Amino acid sequence: TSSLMEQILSNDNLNRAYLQVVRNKGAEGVDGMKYTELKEYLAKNGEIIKEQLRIRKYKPQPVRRVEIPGVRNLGVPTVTDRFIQQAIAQVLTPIYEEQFHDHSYGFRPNRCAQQAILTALDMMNDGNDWIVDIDLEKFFDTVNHDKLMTIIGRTIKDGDVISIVRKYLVSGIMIDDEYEDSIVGTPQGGNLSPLLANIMLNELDKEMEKRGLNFVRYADDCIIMVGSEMSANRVMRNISRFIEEKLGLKVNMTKSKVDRPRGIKYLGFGFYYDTSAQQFKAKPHA
Amino acid sequence: SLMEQILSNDNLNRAYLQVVRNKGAEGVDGMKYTELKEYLAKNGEIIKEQLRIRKYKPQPVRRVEIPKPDGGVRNLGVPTVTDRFIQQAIAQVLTPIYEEQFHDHSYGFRPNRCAQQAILTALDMMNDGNDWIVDIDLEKFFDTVNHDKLMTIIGRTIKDGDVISIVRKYLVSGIMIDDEYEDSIVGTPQGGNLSPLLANIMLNELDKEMEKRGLNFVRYADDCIIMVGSEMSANRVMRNISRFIEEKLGLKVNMTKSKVDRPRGIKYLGFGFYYDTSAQQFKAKPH
Ligand SMILES: [K+]
Ligand SMILES: [K+]
């Protein structure tokens, strides 16, 4: 992973990134450019954009704050930035798919929220029906950028890629969290930020895997299935300590709780016990 | 040798563990899932012999009232834990054979597939300009399908006469599909793991026809929607596909509940569809 930048700027990778970003549509950024205008803009300024990226002279623009229906706050990068973030992710994704845990399902190829529910249900129905529901503050509102770049540097040795990725963290990229309402569809502004959050939280997956914990994770939304109420409280304190001390994230001790499945709301699903099947099952909550 | 592959020690042991893991209600014999190991330790070789000579006779399914989480009940046919054990053993060998044939846009009761993947694929089609949906509703599969027509289509792939026999006997026993996915319920279905595979084998014929016509579709068991670009082509697809389902597959289309509509009038696998103004694209959420 030394000359990774040239793989990102290749003709085929940029063409596929441009097609995916147009297909994803989405609102406009601070420059007001619609996704229907990216084609002619790259045809006239694409080579200059590539040259600016090689010499680390491309300056990403800040994301636009958009209120979306209550209301939801999202950070929308410009369509040019979404195009570049997609070009980076297409190269970084296959590298990190070899490291990621099988029980991580958020914003990954061929993975969705229902798979996480299914795996968690199979764990509950083996006797691990005491749920540790760790609530984290907004990832990109609390992550230390240098902490994240160091973790990325263990695998990515191309400094040009490290430099441009760091700049997009500065731009304010974040995670469209509409999955919490069981919404299915294309997220906004999430070409690169979800992958970055998975690289970070993969350190939590490896720690939980080290301790033999049964868990599923979707972005920064994780639940842990354990066999007793007391070990649940021990796992609760041990993992929350690891999240704050080793990763620098903040555990919301007001929302985090230990509970039975029927008290858990995860990825928009609730949990109930099927008396006929003699198993826990899941369905959307109110 | 296909029968002997189903009756091998490795296959039957995997089938026992999976059926015990699925738990479930008792069949007509009142045997609980925790009693299958002692029963197989006694009559295991006897059942294997009866299956080799086509002498084993499955028990009829038990009509169980399954309480729904939001009130009311569903009626479901539950095979005995012995028959669920044998149905799983058969399905474990037949699944790799038919996974090679199945269309990528079929998601019902398949390994590593789920309803959300069908929704995501349908969303990508709608947002590409195919926002006219053919919503064909089928009468329940296992009280309308012709057993001979189904066994013939199965026979064109499976040539083992001992496997064709026991599969047909399980059709007569009344196996059916747990349709709780229609209420967005996620979890292990009841009623054995053989009937959904049989339904997919039948409806895979429809998948190949729709693919031959270049149609955009997703299918989950017998619940299929087709994404087309215009209203007149939607009515044309509605007429042509409905005729193919009834004439070539012998299934029955519910003309009252079938319709041509736009996404926000469609309810599919417990999901509804809405338009995200800011994202400028359709999305989905539980209805
Ligand atoms: K959580
Ligand atoms: K349908």
Side-chain angles (χ1 to χ4, degrees):
Chain A
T1 67
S2 304
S3 63
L4 232 51
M5 176 59 62
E6 288 306 316
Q7 307 179 27
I8 301 177
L9 304 182
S10 64
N11 300 323
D12 184 78
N13 186 73
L14 289 183
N15 175 71
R16 293 169 63 88
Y18 147 77
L19 287 177
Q20 186 60 64
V21 164
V22 170
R23 196 187 217 262
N24 290 350
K25 299 198 181 66
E28 60 197 31
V30 297
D31 63 341
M33 187 180 305
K34 306 173 181 181
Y35 67 91
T36 53
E37 297 161 339
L38 181 68
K39 184 187 215 295
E40 67 194 75
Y41 183 81
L42 295 184
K44 187 171 184 175
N45 305 318
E47 280 307 303
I48 293 297
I49 286 176
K50 290 164 62 178
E51 247 317 283
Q52 291 293 106
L53 283 165
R54 300 191 212 271
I55 60 186
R56 307 180 188 180
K57 289 319 192 73
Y58 178 86
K59 187 177 291 293
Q61 293 209 254
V63 303
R64 177 163 75 96
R65 303 303 312 194
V66 181
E67 282 190 351
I68 292 176
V71 298
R72 192 168 83 255
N73 276 318
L74 280 176
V76 175
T78 70
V79 66
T80 300
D81 284 327
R82 305 207 300 269
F83 156 74
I84 301 178
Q85 294 164 20
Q86 176 68 28
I88 302 173
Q90 286 173 184
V91 174
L92 264 48
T93 296
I95 296 178
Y96 281 98
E97 285 290 307
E98 301 186 29
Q99 309 179 12
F100 285 169
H101 197 279
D102 189 43
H103 296 160
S104 171
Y105 303 91
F107 305 96
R108 290 183 60 186
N110 310 314
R111 291 177 183 261
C112 65
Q114 268 188 3
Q115 300 172 340
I117 299 299
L118 271 166
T119 299
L121 285 175
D122 292 16
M123 292 166 165
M124 297 173 185
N125 291 318
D126 285 331
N128 308 288
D129 46 32
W130 285 95
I131 316 301
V132 177
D133 186 23
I134 304 281
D135 190 78
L136 267 35
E137 297 289 343
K138 291 283 189 172
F139 180 87
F140 286 91
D141 293 336
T142 55
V143 59
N144 178 267
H145 292 163
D146 309 279
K147 227 291 131 50
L148 178 56
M149 298 316 302
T150 299
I151 296 177
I152 297 177
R154 300 174 187 169
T155 307
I156 309 303
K157 304 302 179 181
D158 191 322
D160 297 321
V161 179
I162 294 296
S163 174
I164 184 61
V165 165
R166 173 181 289 273
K167 291 179 183 178
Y168 276 120
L169 293 170
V170 180
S171 66
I173 57 175
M174 46 82 68
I175 297 177
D176 189 342
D177 67 340
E178 65 185 1
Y179 59 83
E180 289 183 348
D181 300 319
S182 289
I183 289 176
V184 178
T186 302
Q188 284 212 72
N191 309 77
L192 179 59
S193 47
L195 172 58
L196 299 178
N198 277 332
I199 298 168
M200 174 90 147
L201 295 163
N202 174 69
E203 302 297 319
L204 177 62
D205 300 343
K206 289 183 295 183
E207 179 71 13
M208 290 181 298
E209 154 105 323
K210 248 183 55 182
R211 308 181 184 184
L213 297 177
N214 305 282
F215 72 92
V216 296
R217 184 172 63 78
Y218 192 102
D220 49 14
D221 215 313
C222 172
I223 61 174
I224 302 168
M225 275 58 57
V226 296
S228 59
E229 176 181 4
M230 225 56 255
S231 60
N233 296 129
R234 279 183 285 273
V235 167
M236 166 84 118
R237 303 188 307 265
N238 291 15
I239 296 304
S240 295
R241 205 194 323 272
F242 174 87
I243 292 182
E244 295 190 357
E245 295 179 352
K246 275 69 185 182
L247 299 180
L249 305 174
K250 229 297 163 52
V251 179
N252 193 333
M253 269 300 168
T254 299
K255 201 270 190 175
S256 298
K257 68 178 179 184
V258 170
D259 206 340
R260 303 292 287 176
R262 123 244 205 277
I264 297 302
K265 280 165 161 43
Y266 185 61
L267 307 180
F269 283 92
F271 296 87
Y272 69 98
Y273 188 77
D274 191 318
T275 65
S276 178
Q278 304 183 56
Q279 274 185 331
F280 285 104
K281 299 192 176 187
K283 66 137 44 189
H285 69 76
Chain B
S1 185
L2 211 67
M3 182 74 266
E4 295 301 323
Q5 194 172 347
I6 298 178
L7 296 187
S8 74
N9 271 265
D10 182 39
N11 189 76
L12 294 181
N13 191 71
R14 276 142 48 197
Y16 161 81
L17 294 176
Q18 186 67 248
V19 169
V20 168
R21 198 152 192 255
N22 296 152
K23 293 198 179 64
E26 307 88 338
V28 293
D29 62 347
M31 185 181 305
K32 302 170 176 55
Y33 72 94
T34 50
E35 298 168 337
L36 179 63
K37 186 159 73 174
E38 296 182 307
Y39 185 79
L40 289 182
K42 174 190 299 180
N43 303 99
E45 214 66 25
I46 292 182
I47 295 175
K48 296 170 63 177
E49 171 71 16
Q50 291 182 140
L51 285 171
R52 290 192 173 103
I53 63 180
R54 311 183 186 184
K55 186 162 160 286
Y56 180 82
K57 291 175 170 50
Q59 294 286 338
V61 299
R62 185 167 72 94
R63 286 89 63 180
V64 177
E65 296 193 288
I66 299 181
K68 299 199 284 181
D70 61 333
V73 291
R74 294 186 308 110
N75 298 291
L76 193 137
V78 177
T80 64
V81 74
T82 296
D83 287 321
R84 302 206 298 269
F85 158 71
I86 299 178
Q87 288 167 25
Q88 174 71 14
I90 297 175
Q92 285 175 179
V93 176
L94 262 49
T95 293
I97 297 177
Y98 282 97
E99 280 292 311
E100 229 284 334
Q101 306 181 21
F102 281 165
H103 197 276
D104 187 53
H105 295 161
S106 175
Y107 302 90
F109 303 92
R110 289 185 57 188
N112 311 293
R113 290 170 181 265
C114 64
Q116 271 186 2
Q117 296 175 338
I119 300 295
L120 273 165
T121 301
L123 287 174
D124 297 339
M125 290 161 173
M126 297 168 180
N127 291 317
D128 282 335
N130 303 293
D131 43 42
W132 284 95
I133 289 81
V134 178
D135 186 20
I136 295 182
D137 185 86
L138 265 34
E139 304 292 345
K140 289 169 77 78
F141 179 87
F142 280 105
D143 46 39
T144 58
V145 65
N146 176 264
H147 292 175
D148 287 331
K149 182 180 285 294
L150 179 53
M151 295 312 304
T152 295
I153 294 182
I154 293 181
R156 307 195 306 206
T157 298
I158 308 302
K159 297 302 176 181
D160 193 315
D162 300 329
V163 177
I164 291 301
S165 180
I166 181 61
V167 164
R168 170 183 288 275
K169 292 179 180 178
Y170 275 128
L171 287 180
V172 179
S173 72
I175 57 175
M176 50 183 297
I177 298 180
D178 187 342
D179 71 340
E180 70 184 359
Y181 63 85
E182 288 184 358
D183 293 333
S184 299
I185 289 177
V186 181
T188 305
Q190 292 207 62
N193 302 333
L194 180 58
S195 46
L197 176 59
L198 302 191
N200 275 338
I201 297 171
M202 181 60 132
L203 293 152
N204 176 255
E205 304 293 310
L206 173 62
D207 295 352
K208 288 179 293 182
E209 176 66 25
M210 294 182 296
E211 174 66 28
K212 185 180 179 180
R213 310 193 185 201
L215 300 176
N216 309 289
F217 72 91
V218 301
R219 184 171 64 76
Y220 191 102
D222 57 346
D223 214 320
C224 165
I225 58 173
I226 307 178
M227 273 59 59
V228 311
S230 70
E231 184 178 20
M232 80 161 181
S233 66
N235 297 316
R236 189 219 87 202
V237 168
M238 168 68 75
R239 288 191 293 274
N240 295 341
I241 299 307
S242 295
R243 178 174 177 178
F244 183 89
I245 292 179
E246 296 193 351
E247 289 187 354
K248 293 303 180 301
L249 304 182
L251 302 175
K252 180 57 186 303
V253 178
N254 191 328
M255 300 266 71
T256 298
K257 304 175 73 65
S258 293
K259 62 172 181 173
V260 167
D261 208 338
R262 290 195 55 90
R264 297 195 288 107
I266 301 293
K267 300 194 177 305
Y268 185 62
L269 276 34
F271 284 92
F273 297 87
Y274 69 100
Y275 190 83
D276 192 317
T277 289
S278 176
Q280 308 183 34
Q281 56 194 127
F282 291 97
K283 294 186 180 183
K285 61 179 176 54
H287 70 73

PDB file of all heavy atoms in Angstrom, chain B residues 135-136 223-225, ligand 2:
ATOM      1  N   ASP B 135     -47.205  -5.022  -9.059  1.00  0.00           N
ATOM      2  CA  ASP B 135     -47.362  -5.666  -7.758  1.00  0.00           C
ATOM      3  C   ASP B 135     -48.340  -6.826  -7.931  1.00  0.00           C
ATOM      4  O   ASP B 135     -49.554  -6.662  -7.800  1.00  0.00           O
ATOM      5  CB  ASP B 135     -47.844  -4.659  -6.712  1.00  0.00           C
ATOM      6  CG  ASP B 135     -47.894  -5.245  -5.316  1.00  0.00           C
ATOM      7  OD1 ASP B 135     -47.228  -6.271  -5.075  1.00  0.00           O
ATOM      8  OD2 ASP B 135     -48.596  -4.674  -4.455  1.00  0.00           O
ATOM      9  N   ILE B 136     -47.800  -8.002  -8.230  1.00  0.00           N
ATOM     10  CA  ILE B 136     -48.606  -9.196  -8.460  1.00  0.00           C
ATOM     11  C   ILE B 136     -48.744  -9.953  -7.145  1.00  0.00           C
ATOM     12  O   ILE B 136     -47.742 -10.319  -6.519  1.00  0.00           O
ATOM     13  CB  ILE B 136     -47.982 -10.085  -9.545  1.00  0.00           C
ATOM     14  CG1 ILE B 136     -47.987  -9.367 -10.894  1.00  0.00           C
ATOM     15  CG2 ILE B 136     -48.730 -11.400  -9.651  1.00  0.00           C
ATOM     16  CD1 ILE B 136     -47.433 -10.199 -12.031  1.00  0.00           C
ATOM     17  N   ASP B 223     -43.510 -13.592  -3.141  1.00  0.00           N
ATOM     18  CA  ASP B 223     -43.844 -12.170  -3.082  1.00  0.00           C
ATOM     19  C   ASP B 223     -42.856 -11.424  -3.975  1.00  0.00           C
ATOM     20  O   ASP B 223     -41.694 -11.230  -3.606  1.00  0.00           O
ATOM     21  CB  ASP B 223     -43.804 -11.666  -1.643  1.00  0.00           C
ATOM     22  CG  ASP B 223     -44.837 -10.593  -1.373  1.00  0.00           C
ATOM     23  OD1 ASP B 223     -45.040  -9.727  -2.250  1.00  0.00           O
ATOM     24  OD2 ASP B 223     -45.453 -10.622  -0.287  1.00  0.00           O
ATOM     25  N   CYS B 224     -43.325 -11.003  -5.148  1.00  0.00           N
ATOM     26  CA  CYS B 224     -42.476 -10.415  -6.176  1.00  0.00           C
ATOM     27  C   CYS B 224     -43.042  -9.076  -6.628  1.00  0.00           C
ATOM     28  O   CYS B 224     -44.261  -8.908  -6.721  1.00  0.00           O
ATOM     29  CB  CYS B 224     -42.350 -11.364  -7.379  1.00  0.00           C
ATOM     30  SG  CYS B 224     -41.685 -10.615  -8.880  1.00  0.00           S
ATOM     31  N   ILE B 225     -42.150  -8.123  -6.901  1.00  0.00           N
ATOM     32  CA  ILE B 225     -42.521  -6.854  -7.516  1.00  0.00           C
ATOM     33  C   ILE B 225     -41.578  -6.593  -8.682  1.00  0.00           C
ATOM     34  O   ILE B 225     -40.396  -6.947  -8.643  1.00  0.00           O
ATOM     35  CB  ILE B 225     -42.494  -5.670  -6.521  1.00  0.00           C
ATOM     36  CG1 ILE B 225     -41.108  -5.504  -5.898  1.00  0.00           C
ATOM     37  CG2 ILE B 225     -43.563  -5.840  -5.444  1.00  0.00           C
ATOM     38  CD1 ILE B 225     -40.973  -4.262  -5.035  1.00  0.00           C
TER      39      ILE B 225
HETATM   40  K     K C   2     -46.237  -8.784  -4.713  1.00  0.00           K
END
